[PDB]
């Protein structure tokens, strides 16, 4: 079924700028690959950080490479409460009016004034696949999950880009609410 | 009409008298902290620590009153934190379930069973069930609006006299829908 798409489940994690990488891991430090993600060029790094909010901290928070233009922190709704912040629900890069927190690495720390979000679900899709399915960048679709916690997710954003692999991204709470894990399959309706 | 209020459940425990005595002392009684929506049910002041093969969860709320048999309700995520795989179950369906060590102020007990991931359900008063043409054991689709809107399939209807109209979901199910206590969802 060509409308079936693989699931990628995201635990809390961070993307770093070079300025913050330098602060956290030392000047000129380079991320080490641990595991490639499904999206071209993206990977889980060996490196981890601590996130510290007004209420508490989350440790062993995975860094995702490569480095980006701007630091971005993705956490679950649950994580927000543990941290003591209220991150808005956003697509990647949509960081206007977002809270920050303190990031701690082995060689230093920095207190960000912004950049923390709850990740809004979405489907990455290659232009060829989009053509075959009749979808365009920015379309919203329903997505159905089978099984014991089966259901439908409404108005899921389609992100079409040449450097993309066909994959739906949801966070760990969204996945557990559907009894899904990495490489499970869902269906675009 | 077909609208029902949401009740969101964090991890918690229901205790037997035998286990209550061990954990909190012989003849100890639960102290009421807050009434739940369901008649007779309440969050207690008492809390325990849950300990599994991999790790522990602390400040786990006890729900009263005491029951015939200890039952532990945790999230899928909680299962991974503890190091067990609880099946998805309705309350009281505890055959072939894993256990845990329950740690209290006056003692501890290692249970050989009783931990579940709570399966979502709607508590419904018989009058309400009548109005909606629903009977006990029926399954229904439930829709949530908002920015994580969607539909939950095959939600079990639990009719009983001592019930209030309320959907019960766990904290991950709620956060996956950006719902909290007293938000309204709709039976399809
Ligand atoms: C079951 C219940 C009593 C659990 O007790 P509890 O854990 O003490 O409940 P609380 O609401 O006080 O939870 C407080 C914690 O949840 C956190 N929290 C708040 N919103 C949260 C969210 N959306 N996601 C994750 N955590 C959240 C708080 O930060 C707090 O953390 P802290 O203790 O470290 O300060 C409670 O969930 C409840 O009353 N549910 C109503 C639904 C119901 O009736 N269930 C019946 C089960 S049979
Ligand atoms: C984002 C990512 C790299 C985060 O790295 P990570 O946190 O190190 O990932 P892991 O899968 O190894 O998480 C392992 C932890 O999750 C726990 N875990 C496993 N399944 C779980 C579940 N269903 N619910 C909660 N926790 C779970 C494990 O017990 C373990 O905890 P521990 O470290 O205390 O032992 C990872 O989630 C991922 O690879 N996602 C793929 C999807 C993707 O590409 N997202 C990109 C977003 S831009
Ligand atoms: Zn990310
Ligand atoms: Zn993504
Ligand atoms: Zn319960
Ligand atoms: Zn219930």
Author numbering:
A (entry chain B): 36 to 224
B (entry chain A): 37 to 224
Paper text:
We collected a native dataset from rPduLΔEP crystals diffracting to a resolution of 1.54 Å. A CoA cofactor as well as two metal ions are clearly resolved in the density (for omit maps of CoA see S2 Fig). CoA and the metal ions bind between the two domains, presumably in the active site. The first zinc ion (Zn1) is in a tetrahedral coordination state with His48, His50, Glu109, and the CoA sulfur. The second (Zn2) is in octahedral coordination by three conserved histidine residues (His157, His159 and His204) as well as three water molecules. The interface between the two chains buries 882 Å2 per monomer and is mainly formed by α-helices 2 and 4 and parts of β-sheets 12 and 14, as well as a π–π stacking of the adenine moiety of CoA with Phe116 of the adjacent chain. Our PduL crystals contained CoA that was captured from the Escherichia coli cytosol, indicating that the “ground state” of PduL is in the CoA-bound form; this could provide an elegantly simple means of guaranteeing a 1:1 ratio of CoA:PduL within the metabolosome lumen. The free CoA-bound form is presumably poised for attack upon an acyl-phosphate, indicating that the enzyme initially binds CoA as opposed to acyl-phosphate. This hypothesis is strengthened by the fact that the CoA-bound crystals were obtained without added CoA, indicating that the protein bound CoA from the E. coli expression strain and retained it throughout purification and crystallization. SEC-MALS analysis of rPdulΔEP is consistent with a dimer (as observed in the crystal structure) with a weighted average (Mw) and number average (Mn) of the molar mass of 58.4 kDa +/− 11.2% and 58.8 kDa +/− 10.9%, respectively. rPduL full length runs as Mw = 140.3 kDa +/− 1.2% and Mn = 140.5 kDa +/− 1.2%.
More recently, a second type of PTAC without any sequence homology to Pta was identified. This protein, PduL (Pfam domain PF06130), was shown to catalyze the conversion of propionyl-CoA to propionyl-phosphate and is associated with a BMC involved in propanediol utilization, the PDU BMC. Not only does PduL facilitate substrate level phosphorylation, but it also is critical for cofactor recycling within, and product efflux from, the organelle. Structurally, PduL consists of two domains (blue/red), each a beta-barrel that is capped on both ends by short α-helices. β-Barrel 1 consists of the N-terminal β strand and β strands from the C-terminal half of the polypeptide chain (β1, β10-β14; residues 37–46 and 155–224). β-Barrel 2 consists mainly of the central segment of primary structure (β2, β5–β9; residues 47–60 and 82–154) (red), but is interrupted by a short two-strand beta sheet (β3-β4, residues 61–81). The active site of PduL is formed at the interface of the two structural domains.
